[PDB]
Design a binder for this molecule. Structure first.
Ligand code: HEC
Ligand SMILES: [C-]#N
Ligand SMILES: [K+]
Ligand SMILES: [Xe]
Ligand SMILES: [Xe]
Ligand SMILES: [Xe]
Ligand SMILES: [Xe]
Length: 128
């Protein structure tokens, strides 16, 4: 709880400052409308239950951004290993994320802050 967290004098999480759970659901719908609309990335999600993924991804980003909700998915290295995902691909994905965040009116300093929280994860997402 935001209020309870501030009662304990803990610093505001990225999760809170952008609107917690529901802000993230909304971004994630847009995000995937943008990823699935992109011809360089579409194919990747050909054999995928998107509803299941969106659910899993709301959990991951929420978790990653400071939320109290649990990730109930597979590890990042494993799911992405062998899918031929390159940095070129990682970055385009990181683009739609940002556009989606921007479109949700999230300030750019905070978008840039989320990107720098996700970026490291590339090591686990790409091949090289
Ligand atoms: C364009 C390729 C691509 C990029 C870039 C990528 N992923 Fe994914 N990822 C996939 C695909 C495809 C799946 C679904 C595979 C399946 O259907 O089982 C997936 C699955 C996932 C899942 C759910 C895993 C599960 O347990 O089902 C999460 C969470 C996730 N990715 C997060 C991320 C995060 C966080 C990043 C960036 C830091 C990222 N992905 C970058 C292609 C990508
Ligand atoms: C991203 N899945
Ligand atoms: K895999
Ligand atoms: Xe997000
Ligand atoms: Xe996302
Ligand atoms: Xe992402
Ligand atoms: Xe980044």
């Amino acid at each position: 709880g935001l209020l309870s967290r501030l009662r304990k004098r803990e610093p505001i999480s990225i999760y809170d400052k952008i609107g917690g759970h529901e802000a993230i659901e909304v971004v994630v719908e847009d995000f995937y409308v943008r990823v699935l609309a992109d011809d360089q990335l579409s194919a990747f999600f050909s054999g995928t239950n998107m509803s299941r993924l969106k659910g899993k991804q709301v959990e991951f980003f929420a978790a990653a951004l400071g939320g109290p909700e649990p990730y109930t998915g597979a590890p990042m290295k494993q799911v992405h290993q062998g899918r031929g995902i390159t940095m070129h691909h990682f970055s385009l994905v990181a683009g739609h994320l940002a556009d989606a965040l921007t479109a949700a009116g999230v300030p750019s300093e905070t978008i840039t802050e989320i990107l720098g929280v996700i970026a490291p994860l590339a090591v686990d997402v790409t091949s090289g």
